[PDB]
């Protein structure tokens, strides 16, 4: 068996330029979940769940 | 067996330019889930679930 | 067996330019799920579910 | 005399997003003038000449 | 005489995002003038000449 | 005479984000003038000439 991994790329982010001009930014949360403003995020998972911008209100039993 | 992985790309983001000009940005949440503003996100999952901008209100039993 | 993977691309995003000029942006959520504003997102999943901008109100039993 | 200058805008540039993906860029010049790649330039002149991307080969007498 | 200058803007640049991905960039010049790559430049001139990306090969007499 | 200068802006640059990914950048010059790579430059001139990215090969008499 011969695996040759040359310059491979998995879960990669490069060359990102952003500008944000906001006068007012407000977030109100009451017993939930809120995710805002996620930029230039990379990951790699092996034998597991991969979530990036995940939000769940609640879990009950 | 001979696997030759040359310059392959999987789950890759590059060359992104964004500008956002907002006067007011408001988020109100009551017992739910809210995801906003996700930019330039890359990932790779093996033997698992891959979610990026996932929102779920709630889970009950 | 000989697999030769040359410069292949799977789940790739490049060369994206966006401008957003908004005066007011409002999100109200009561016990649901809301996903807004997803830009330049790439992923690759193997043996799993791949969701990007997924929203589910709630799950009950 | 009453001049009221409220939020006026003269020679203004805002909200610009550009991406350039070039493999090779070459410029050869022999005794001339070359102007390339001008982005997001603003100016205001009073009692004078306003040139932005101006090129002149040569002047002789 | 009453001049009221409120929030006026003259020769202004804001909110600029750029990405440049080049493998090779070459400039050869022999006895001339070359201007390249000018981004987000603002100016204001009063009683004079305003040039931004100006190139002139030569002047002789 | 009453001049009221409130929050005026003249020759202003703000909110600039740039990324440059180059493998090779070369400039060769023989008896000329070369200007490259000018970013986020602001100025104001009163009773004079305003040049930003100006190049002149030569002047003779």
UniProtKB/Swiss-Prot annotation, chains A, B, C, D, E, F:
Changing residue 14 to Q: In PARK1; no effect on protein structure; no effect on phosphorylation of the protein; no effect on membrane- and lipid-binding; increases oligomerization; increases fibril formation; increases secretion of the protein; impairs copper-binding. Cu cation binds at residue 14. Sequence repeats lie at residues 6-20, 21-31. Phosphorylated, predominantly on serine residues. Phosphorylation by CK1 appears to occur on residues distinct from the residue phosphorylated by other kinases. Highly expressed in presynaptic terminals in the central nervous system. Expressed principally in brain. Residues 1-31 are annotated as: 4 X 11 AA tandem repeats of [EGS]-K-T-K-[EQ]-[GQ]-V-X(4). Changing residue 21 to K: Increases oligomerization. It is found in: Cytoplasm; Membrane; Nucleus; Synapse. The modification Phosphoserine is found at residue 51. It comes from the Eukaryota. Belongs to the synuclein family. It is linked to Genetic alterations of SNCA resulting in aberrant polymerization into fibrils, are associated with several neurodegenerative diseases (synucleinopathies). SNCA fibrillar aggregates represent the major non A-beta component of Alzheimer disease amyloid plaque, and a major component of Lewy body inclusions. They are also found within Lewy body (LB)-like intraneuronal inclusions, glial inclusions and axonal spheroids in neurodegeneration with brain iron accumulation type 1. Parkinson disease 1, autosomal dominant: A complex neurodegenerative disorder characterized by bradykinesia, resting tremor, muscular rigidity and postural instability. Additional features are characteristic postural abnormalities, dysautonomia, dystonic cramps, and dementia. The pathology of Parkinson disease involves the loss of dopaminergic neurons in the substantia nigra and the presence of Lewy bodies (intraneuronal accumulations of aggregated proteins), in surviving neurons in various areas of the brain. Neuronal protein that plays several roles in synaptic activity such as regulation of synaptic vesicle trafficking and subsequent neurotransmitter release. Participates as a monomer in synaptic vesicle exocytosis by enhancing vesicle priming, fusion and dilation of exocytotic fusion pores. Mechanistically, acts by increasing local Ca(2+) release from microdomains which is essential for the enhancement of ATP-induced exocytosis. The 'non A-beta component of Alzheimer disease amyloid plaque' domain (NAC domain) is involved in fibrils formation. The middle hydrophobic region forms the core of the filaments. The C-terminus may regulate aggregation and determine the diameter of the filaments. Soluble monomer. Homotetramer. A dynamic intracellular population of tetramers and monomers coexists normally and the tetramer plays an essential role in maintaining homeostasis. Interacts with UCHL1. Interacts with phospholipase D and histones. Interacts (via N-terminus) with synphilin-1/SNCAIP; this interaction promotes formation of SNCA inclusions in the cytoplasm. Interacts with CALM1. Interacts with STXBP1; this interaction controls SNCA self-replicating aggregation. Interacts with SNARE components VAMP2 and SNAP25; these interactions allows SNARE complex assembly and integrity. This is Alpha-synuclein. The gene is SNCA. The chain holds residues 37 to 97 of 140 of the full protein.
């Amino acid at each position: 068996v011969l695996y040759v991994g040359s310059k491979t790329k998995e879960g990669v982010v490069h060359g990102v330029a952003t500008v944000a001009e906001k006068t007012k930014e407000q977030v109100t949360n009451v017993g939930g979940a809120v995710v805002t403003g996620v930029t230039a995020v990379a990951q790699k998972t092996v034998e597991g769940a991969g979530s990036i911008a995940a939000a769940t209100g609640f879990v009950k039993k």
